[PDB]
Amino acid sequence: DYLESLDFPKVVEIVKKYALSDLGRKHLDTLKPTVNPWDELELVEELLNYFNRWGEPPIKGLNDISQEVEKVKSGSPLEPWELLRVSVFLEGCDILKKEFEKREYSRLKETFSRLSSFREFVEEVNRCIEQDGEISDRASPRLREIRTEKKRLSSEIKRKADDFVRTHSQILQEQMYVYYLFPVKASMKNAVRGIVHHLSSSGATVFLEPDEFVELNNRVRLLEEEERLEISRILRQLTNILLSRLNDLERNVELIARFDSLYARVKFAREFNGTVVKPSSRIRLVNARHPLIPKERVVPINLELPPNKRGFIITGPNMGGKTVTVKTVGLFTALMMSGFPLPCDEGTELKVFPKIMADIGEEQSIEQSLSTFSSHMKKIVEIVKNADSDSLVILDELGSGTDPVEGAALAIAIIEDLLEKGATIFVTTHLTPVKVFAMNHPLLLNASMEFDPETLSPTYRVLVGVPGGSHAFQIAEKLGLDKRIIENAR
Amino acid sequence: MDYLESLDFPKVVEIVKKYALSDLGRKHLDTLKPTVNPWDELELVEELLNYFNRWGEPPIKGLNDISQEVEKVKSGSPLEPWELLRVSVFLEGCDILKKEFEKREYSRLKETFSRLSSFREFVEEVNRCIEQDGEISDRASPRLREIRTEKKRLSSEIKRKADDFVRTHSQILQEQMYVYRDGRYLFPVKASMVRGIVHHTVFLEPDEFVELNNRVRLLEEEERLEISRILRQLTNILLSRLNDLERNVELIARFDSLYARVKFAREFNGTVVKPSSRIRLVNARHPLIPKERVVPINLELPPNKRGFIITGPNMGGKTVTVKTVGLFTALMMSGFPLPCDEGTELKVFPKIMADIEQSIEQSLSTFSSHMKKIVEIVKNADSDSLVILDELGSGTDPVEGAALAIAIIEDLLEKGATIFVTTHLTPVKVFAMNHPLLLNASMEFDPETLSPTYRVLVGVPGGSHAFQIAEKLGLDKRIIENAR
Ligand SMILES: Nc1ncnc2c1ncn2[C@@H]1O[C@H](COP(=O)(O)OP(=O)(O)NP(=O)(O)O)[C@@H](O)[C@H]1O
Numbered sequence: 001d002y003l004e005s006l007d008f009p010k011v012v013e014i015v016k017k018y019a020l021s022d023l024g025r026k027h028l029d030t031l032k033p034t035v036n037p038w039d040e041l042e043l044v045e046e047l048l049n050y051f052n053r054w055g056e057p058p059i060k061g062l063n064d065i066s067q068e069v070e071k072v073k074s075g076s077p078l079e080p081w082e083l084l085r086v087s088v089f090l091e092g093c094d095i096l097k098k099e100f101e102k103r104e105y106s107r108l109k110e111t112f113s114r115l116s117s118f119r120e121f122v123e124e125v126n127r128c129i130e131q132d133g134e135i136s137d138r139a140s141p142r143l144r145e146i147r148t149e150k151k152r153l154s155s156e157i158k159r160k161a162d163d164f165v166r167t168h169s170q171i172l173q174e175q176m177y178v179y180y181l182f183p184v185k186a187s188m189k190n191a192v193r194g195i196v197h198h199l200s201s202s203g204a205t206v207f208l209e210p211d212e213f214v215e216l217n218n219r220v221r222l223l224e225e226e227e228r229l230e231i232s233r234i235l236r237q238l239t240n241i242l243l244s245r246l247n248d249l250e251r252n253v254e255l256i257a258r259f260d261s262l263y264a265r266v267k268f269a270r271e272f273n274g275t276v277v278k279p280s281s282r283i284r285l286v287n288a289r290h291p292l293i294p295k296e297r298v299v300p301i302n303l304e305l306p307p308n309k310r311g312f313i314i315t316g317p318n319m320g321g322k323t324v325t326v327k328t329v330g331l332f333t334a335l336m337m338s339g340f341p342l343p344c345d346e347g348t349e350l351k352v353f354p355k356i357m358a359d360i361g362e363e364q365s366i367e368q369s370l371s372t373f374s375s376h377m378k379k380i381v382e383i384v385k386n387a388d389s390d391s392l393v394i395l396d397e398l399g400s401g402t403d404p405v406e407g408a409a410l411a412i413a414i415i416e417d418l419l420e421k422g423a424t425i426f427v428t429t430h431l432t433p434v435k436v437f438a439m440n441h442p443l444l445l446n447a448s449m450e451f452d453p454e455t456l457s458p459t460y461r462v463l464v465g466v467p468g469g470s471h472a473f474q475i476a477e478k479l480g481l482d483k484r485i486i487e488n489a490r
Numbered sequence: 491m492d493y494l495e496s497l498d499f500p501k502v503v504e505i506v507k508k509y510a511l512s513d514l515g516r517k518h519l520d521t522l523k524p525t526v527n528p529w530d531e532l533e534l535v536e537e538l539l540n541y542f543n544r545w546g547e548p549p550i551k552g553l554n555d556i557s558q559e560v561e562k563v564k565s566g567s568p569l570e571p572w573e574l575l576r577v578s579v580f581l582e583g584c585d586i587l588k589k590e591f592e593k594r595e596y597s598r599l600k601e602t603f604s605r606l607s608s609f610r611e612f613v614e615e616v617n618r619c620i621e622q623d624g625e626i627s628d629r630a631s632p633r634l635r636e637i638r639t640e641k642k643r644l645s646s647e648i649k650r651k652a653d654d655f656v657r658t659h660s661q662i663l664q665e666q667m668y669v670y671r672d673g674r675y676l677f678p679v680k681a682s683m684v685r686g687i688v689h690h691t692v693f694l695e696p697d698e699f700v701e702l703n704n705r706v707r708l709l710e711e712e713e714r715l716e717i718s719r720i721l722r723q724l725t726n727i728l729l730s731r732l733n734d735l736e737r738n739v740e741l742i743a744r745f746d747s748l749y750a751r752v753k754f755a756r757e758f759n760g761t762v763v764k765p766s767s768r769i770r771l772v773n774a775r776h777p778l779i780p781k782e783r784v785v786p787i788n789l790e791l792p793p794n795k796r797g798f799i800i801t802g803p804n805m806g807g808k809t810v811t812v813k814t815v816g817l818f819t820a821l822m823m824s825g826f827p828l829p830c831d832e833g834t835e836l837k838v839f840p841k842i843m844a845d846i847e848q849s850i851e852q853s854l855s856t857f858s859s860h861m862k863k864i865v866e867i868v869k870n871a872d873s874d875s876l877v878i879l880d881e882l883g884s885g886t887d888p889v890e891g892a893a894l895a896i897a898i899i900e901d902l903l904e905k906g907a908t909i910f911v912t913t914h915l916t917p918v919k920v921f922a923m924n925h926p927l928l929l930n931a932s933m934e935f936d937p938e939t940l941s942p943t944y945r946v947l948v949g950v951p952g953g954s955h956a957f958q959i960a961e962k963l964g965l966d967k968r969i970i971e972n973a974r
């Protein structure tokens with residue numbers, strides 16, 4: 001997997017932090033390098049100008065209702081709190097579709113005009129169900145009647161109960177009523193003709209239902225079952241509105257996922273000062289800023305591959321930015337080809353590469369017989385076998401992991417093989433014969449990361465044409481190595 | 491990665507955890523870490539290894555993870571009948587494990603598992619009150635079955651009286667039947683409404699049946715009150731010996747970790763290596779390498795030598811070998827046996843450091859990830875430090891990296907550290923043969939088969955053989971030809 005070597009999912013995860021739901025999160029994970037990304041980029045470019053013009057678009061209610069949609073598809077009825085979620089999400093779909101028709105943005109308009117209006121469903125839910133989740137009296141007249149009769153009956157028992165309390169103050173432990181039954185004391189149990197239900201943990205209370213309370217409690221309990229039965233009919237009738245338009249609802253959920261993936265990419269562009277770069281025939285970075293470096297630390301990278309060139313060998317000091325710069329070419333190419341905007345300045349150009357390959361990093365596994373040399377070389381054999389004119393190749397620390405005289409000879413032959421095959425390559429190295437082969441070969445270009453002599457530090461500037469060295473002693477000193485060991489080394 | 495992670499230590503501990511009887515031993519195996527005095531831990535493994543070959547597997551039935559039942563007691567809550575049976579079978583598994591070790595000749599086993607306190611009374615009180623299926627027997631208490639005798643005798647009586655009421659009151663009954671609902675006998679009386687309670691033809695409960703159906707409800711709630719009285723009296727038997735109980739759960743966890751280590755050594759042909767004064771691997775087999783693929787490793791650090799410099803072919807085993815010295819040392823100090831031969835010697839090192847590269851955009855490069863660790867190791871290396879340095883000097887130009895590798899090795903040798911390194915830089919190789927504290931080693935390569943053999947050749951330096959190994963991994967011959 002070459003995208004992982006170029007930190008591709010780490011940058012997508014940065015974009016996913018702006019998604020308004022886990023719908024766009026899942027859809028962003030579907031965006032991978034394609035040969036024809038123009039439609040995806042123009043959609044990002046359209047919503048980008050939208051933000052600059054009219055600000056953030058309407059987004060209230062655009063939550064992840066994937067679970068609720070499956071429950072309807074499964075045939076089950078939705079709970080009142082689920083119908084509220086689906087409704088506020090469907091009303092959000094209505095506002096989003098409407099808002100994209102009064103504006104100038106074409107591709108946004110034709111794409112999300114495919115949303116399905118559920119204005120009928122949103123009205124029934126807002127009429128039957130209130131904000132806290134209860135069923136409103138306005139739902140059905142039948143429920144309205146049962147509640148009135150249940151309240152009228154419950155007001156009678158509570159009046160009769162307070163009469164039983166004031167008149168039977170000698171048989172009651174606590175002078176009250178419970179749950180509708182009475183806390184009568186045992187021993188004084190057979191005093192009132194009634195039905196025994198529950199006993200106290202010490203055998204003191206006999207929680208009894210008096211004679212004149214049995215049929216009344218039963219009438220109230222039937223009214224409650226009537227209320228429960230009517231609510232289940234109200235919820236079924238509401239969920240059926242969604243069941244009858246299941247395809248319309250599932251299309252609304254995918255379109256919000258797509259819009260959410262576009263919404264996250266646009267807000268990523270404004271935080272990082274992004275630019276929508278489209279496939280060109282040149283590779284030029286203009287003040288490119290790696291999204292994984294903090295803004296306070298990042299130094300923009302300027303690089304341009306001349307048209308008469310095919311390879312870029314990068315040398316320079318340790319921690320000078322050789323690998324990061326080589327990563328930015330592969331990453332930004334894979335990002336544009338996926339449909340993402342790029343943290344760079346206007347004028348940046350990149351080129352569609354059907355084959356993007358990278359050899360970055362070393363893996364040590366005993367199980368996979370993986371060694372420093374083996375993990376690199378097993379990728380090299382992969383790349384060499386499939387490198388052609390459509391291939392862009394990123395080779396990090398070519399020739400490292402073995403005898404320097406043999407690694408530098410392997411490094412030069414591999415570069416030669418990719419060049420003959422018509423591949424575009426970006427290479428880091430710290431071996432001298434590789435630097436020499438780069439300036440001897442007319443298809444190769446040498447560049448180095450800048451090193452400040454007075455400050456003994458890297459400046460992260462790309463100097464084209466000049467090779468550079470590792471400066472290992474000054475970097476080891478900055479990394480904390482004792483001055484004793486270094487003065488010894490020099 | 492920390493030092494133990496660089497040596498695949500937790501990956502190996504994961505192998506032994508597969509042999510545990512329960513999560514009691516899996517959790518305890520996660521606590522075993524390199525200690526300076528591992529003698530008792532290793533002697534217990536050896537004694538249990540002796541027991542296995544002598545008497546077979548020890549008694550193990552009932553030694554499940556009952557940690558949750560022990561915590562429920564801690565919270566004062568009473569335990570359900572099935573929880574009573576789980577704990578009762580664990581404690582019985584403790585009494586059979588104790589009695590088995592006391593009749594043997596393994597001191598540290600008996601002595602350690604003597605602190606096992608047996609709950610013979612709790613086992614007998616659970617087996618008498620609780621039945622195997624989870625029901626409450628009648629011997630549980632004299633009141634329990636007096637209630638059940640009166641409940642059974644009453645239940646047969648109301649039903650007989652219900653049938654009599656139907657047959658003797660047909661004139662007032664809509665249909666000849668009785669209704670049972672919510673534990674009450676109900677009768678379909680016509681408008682000719684017999685005194686009693688009407689539960690919503692009128693469904694009527696005659697006054698005779700009101701007091702009788704009541705008595706049914708009282709006796710059923712009295713049974714529930716008595717079973718909880720017993721479930722609490724049962725739980726409290728353990729609470730009076732809760733310290734004995736929690737000690738019993740740890741002692742079984744310690745046994746389970748021993749049981750797992752013995753089963754691991756028994757399966758990998760393991761040897762209990764104890765601390766010595768020297769380092770010598772006699773046919774060491776790295777446990778992460780498949781059994782039908784590993785080649786045993788032989789290696790020995792001479793007593794006048796404190797640095798092992800391993801060179802040789804790419805994919806030749808330089809790293810895994812030097813890793814094996816560090817891993818087998820850490821495992822030994824943690825109480826584990828080792829896949830090696832009788833004769834292997836390892837030495838206790840209170841400080842174990844390793845270097846085996848991270849690449850992260852918060853200032854970690856190839857050179858940085860290594861050198862950031864080196865500065866940490868140099869800062870803390872002393873006379874009892876075992877230091878493992880993989881690919882020392884890589885990540886820079888060959889010239890300065892070689893001068894940095896030599897200065898670090900000799901700075902660490904001066905501190906008194908024992909050091910195992912891998913390298914492929916010629917100046918480091920030459921430094922190893924000219925310095926009195928250094929020894930040069932190399933992994934063998936077969937020229938005919940053009941493949942490494944993973945045999946340690948001591949005394950001579952070696953070579954990477956990149957061209958041949960790149961050929962064995964598939965790189966086209968024309969690239970290799972252009973390289974040579
Ligand atoms: N353009 C940049 N602006 C700011 N910081 C940067 C830039 N490029 C790199 N860095 C930082 O510097 C570090 C050096 O990264 P890296 O590219 O691996 O150096 P390197 O040249 O590869 N060192 P090495 O591979 O060991 O020879 C990165 O991890 C970032 O933290």
Ligand SMILES: Nc1ncnc2c1ncn2[C@@H]1O[C@H](COP(=O)(O)OP(=O)(O)NP(=O)(O)O)[C@@H](O)[C@H]1O
Nearest residue numbers: 366369370371372373784785805806807808809810
């Ligand atoms: N004794 C052994 N028996 C069997 N397989 C082994 C043995 N030692 C090593 N291997 C295998 O060989 C692989 C290479 O080992 P490794 O120690 O990484 O070589 P290396 O010398 O470090 N190569 P490099 O570091 O890139 O120069 C390991 O991942 C194992 O799969």
Ligand SMILES: [Mg+2]
Nearest residue numbers: 323396855856
């Ligand atoms: Mg690097």
Ligand SMILES: [Mg+2]
Nearest residue numbers: 371372373809
């Ligand atoms: Mg290695």
